[PDB]
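Schema walkthrough. Field components (list of strings):
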Amino acid sequence: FHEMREPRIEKVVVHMGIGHANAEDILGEITGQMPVRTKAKRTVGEFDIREGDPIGAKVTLRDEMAEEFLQTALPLAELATSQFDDTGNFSFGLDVTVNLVRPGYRVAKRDKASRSIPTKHRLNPADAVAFIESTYDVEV
Amino acid sequence: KPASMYRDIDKPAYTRREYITGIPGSKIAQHKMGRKQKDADDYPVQISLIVEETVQLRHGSLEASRLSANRHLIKELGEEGDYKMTLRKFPHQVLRENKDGMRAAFGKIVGTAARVQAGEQLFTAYCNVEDAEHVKEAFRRAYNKITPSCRIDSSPAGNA
Amino acid sequence: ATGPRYKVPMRRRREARTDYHQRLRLLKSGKPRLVARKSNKHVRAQLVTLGPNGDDTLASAHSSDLAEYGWEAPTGNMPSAYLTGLLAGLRAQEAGVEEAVLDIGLNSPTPGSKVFAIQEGAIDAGLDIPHNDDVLADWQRTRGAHIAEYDEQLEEPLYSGDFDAADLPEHFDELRETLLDGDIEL
Amino acid sequence: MHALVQLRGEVNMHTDIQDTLEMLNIHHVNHCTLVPETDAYRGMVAKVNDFVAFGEPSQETLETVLATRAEPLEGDADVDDEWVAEHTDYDDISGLAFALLSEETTLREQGLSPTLRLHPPRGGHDGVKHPVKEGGQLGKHDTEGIDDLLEAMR
Amino acid sequence: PSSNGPLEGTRGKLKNKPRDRGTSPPQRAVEEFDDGEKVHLKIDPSVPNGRFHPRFDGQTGTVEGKQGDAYKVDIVDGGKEKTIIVTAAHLRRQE
RNA sequence: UUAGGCGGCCACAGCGGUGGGGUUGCCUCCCGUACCCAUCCCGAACACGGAAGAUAAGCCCACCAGCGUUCCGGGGAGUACUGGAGUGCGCGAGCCUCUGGGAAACCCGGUUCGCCGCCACC
RNA sequence: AGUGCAAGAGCAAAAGAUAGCUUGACAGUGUUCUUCCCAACGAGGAACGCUGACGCGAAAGCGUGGUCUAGCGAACCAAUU
RNA sequence: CCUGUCAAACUCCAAACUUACAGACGCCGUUUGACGCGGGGAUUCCGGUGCGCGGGGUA
Ligand SMILES: [Cl-]
Ligand SMILES: [Cl-]
Ligand SMILES: [Mg+2]
Ligand SMILES: [Mg+2]
Ligand SMILES: [Mg+2]
Ligand SMILES: [Mg+2]
Ligand SMILES: [Mg+2]
Ligand SMILES: [Mg+2]
Ligand SMILES: [Mg+2]
Ligand SMILES: [Mg+2]
Ligand SMILES: [Mg+2]
Ligand code: NA
Ligand code: NA
Ligand code: NA
Ligand code: NA
Ligand code: NA
Ligand code: NA
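Field assembly_structure (string):
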């Protein structure tokens, strides 16, 4: 009952919202895998008219690549309460977001018969704080 | 101009403001009068003015008859008497006037009016049993300022 | 859901099981559909035709009823797929069916995939189906050579149950051979 | 089985109404026909409802009118019991009448003109501007009502 | 009319009630008819192709062969005979 | 159908919710990247290979009507509107009678938490 | 929301978006509807075929320009293939 | 929540009614040949009124 209910890190996305790059360099070095250009929709007076055009980069980490990153990332942030998502996700920080979920998320991410995860099976802030807090650090 | 020019409901319904422009503002000062903070259910007596013929009443008449009626109440039951009268109809029908002779005669916008079906209640007042004769007089004055003949109908009030 | 004006997808679209846009281009041929479906453990192949109250299945084959002929290995891989296609293809032939168009449902047209395998099989059973040879996997991978050579990087059995250690794509040959043979009770 | 009688002329009456009166074999004022009571026929008489007088006649009444105004498909031949017998599947007028009322046969199947060309109503009718429920003479009638009319147009 | 195009005055007949909105089921789009078959004509608001002139919505013709995948349906406009090229999506069997 | 595949009708099937169900069986989640194949970066997905674990998701089964929907009863209502007729009424706007049709809102109470077809299958 | 532009209509594993490839905005010749309801009338328009050659796709298939209804012009003469 | 009104270019609804095709009855046609086909000859393209439904207009 528990085994297929206990949280896990599905992905940790680390991106730098610049606005016009050289940044990709450090991300690859801090994460362990290639970066990703980040374009933008709509035009802004902030000389940011070019719809499609580099502006930032990101990296989606999974499995060890994500843990080995948190084993040093987390230690550099004072996790708080309000810093948590309604689904048990939290973003701190250079941006570093952590997506937490239960063992059957693939049901909502696969192509065939895909379905959305029932709320009861959804993660909660508490359940999130718990899992994480239970891994070398403190909550609030 | 005479109401003889607009009292009949023979033209199409003409109310779509997304297609009509330059509609004159309504002269109707207010629809809810008396003590509008109180409820109509807080009164024992409820009398309404009922239009006996389906017609069109221009905003100028509604105001005139509403005014002459409420003004009476205010005068008899003081500026803050225990009562509340309501004008339930709003002048949605836009009016034209062709003011070339019959050439390109679609008239220009000159006003608004409310279409009232016979049997409907134009006004509805609410008072205590000791004011019925005043609200009845207010209504009498009001129906002298609109085209149709009307009934001063007493609804909740078996205190006769 | 929300109001009288709300639009609810066709049931099989809510279920995310049928792609009606592809279903249409597919039905246009006028030929029976060779439905190729997968499971985590199994592979299915059906020959479907249009009917007054829903589709009619004229012949099918499931990777499981493959054992009914000697298959003693897993039933959700390439050799398994190909064979399930050939089997369904043979029954189809028996049913008077001669041609069909490959319907892979919500699966991806990835080169060398199992659906194209189910396709190569049905085709070999003698069924004419619009196809493209170089989108099919090379003969060896259909046999199971990719899995055998994988067990070479052994150190530990690729198969838990006791079905050899280095596996046998020969079993594939022996099975195919069995189906091609005129006898075999379809 | 109802008895149809045109009481209002063709001038100014709708064509589709006039064509119905003709499909019911009536082409003149004061002419009468005997029509079965079917869904189809009901539709037709309802449509003609305002220029006709109709209802179910009494066996007797029918007999009187048949004897007095029935005609062969051709010729002046008077339709009397003998005629009726020597030409129809019946022995007399009452036999025929009964058949008509019970919608077992039609004036045609017996070689009779489908129309009873009646005479103007002795004493006059109740007016062609109002229906029966209003003192008029138009529309559906009681057997006692139709009878009076038919017998007066004897 | 203020203009005389094909879709003139077809706001109603060429629009779906909110719930019938969205792609139509493929079944009737592939139905097969045989010559002599009486078929009702009615454009499906959701299906662009294979339509006929809106004036003919409501007609009940007689299938008489086909052209490509579309059918050739015979009807009578008023008193004039016409042949309409229409696909199954916009047809229904009579009775 | 002790959990499957393809559908038809496309909400009576939607939204929300409760209970139940799986040792070599089924569907899954699940385990895992040498390969076919794959991510503008991630075996997440897609694809491939596989069974240590699980029934918590999904799914299947039984059920709840609060919302949305379908239909029915009673009431609203033979009201509103209306095809045909009138030397009926009304200054008139308009109304009325006869004949043939006949709503909508809303309320109260029932119904509906899908139906059916082909194939496969302890 | 978006879908070039009126208005009305169509569209969600798309008709929208992004990416990539591509030139079917192809030649020839028809059927049918429209222009012109019914009911004769040209240019123009559209729908739907076929022959030939191609593009894309695993394939069914899609592409006879733009999601649909506006964006058009006779004879004589000239230039052009 | 409670409370007051509307729509030619609004619609969750929705008639009467008009309309395609078919069957049935009726009526009509098979010496009065209908339905349809081909051909000759026109006149006509200032209309008006009542009723129902209208759009414009104070009328
Ligand atoms: Cl599948
Ligand atoms: Cl057409
Ligand atoms: Mg004679
Ligand atoms: Mg006399
Ligand atoms: Mg008289
Ligand atoms: Mg309209
Ligand atoms: Mg459970
Ligand atoms: Mg197009
Ligand atoms: Mg010239
Ligand atoms: Mg030139
Ligand atoms: Mg009409
Ligand atoms: Na880029
Ligand atoms: Na002028
Ligand atoms: Na007055
Ligand atoms: Na649709
Ligand atoms: Na489960
Ligand atoms: Na042309």
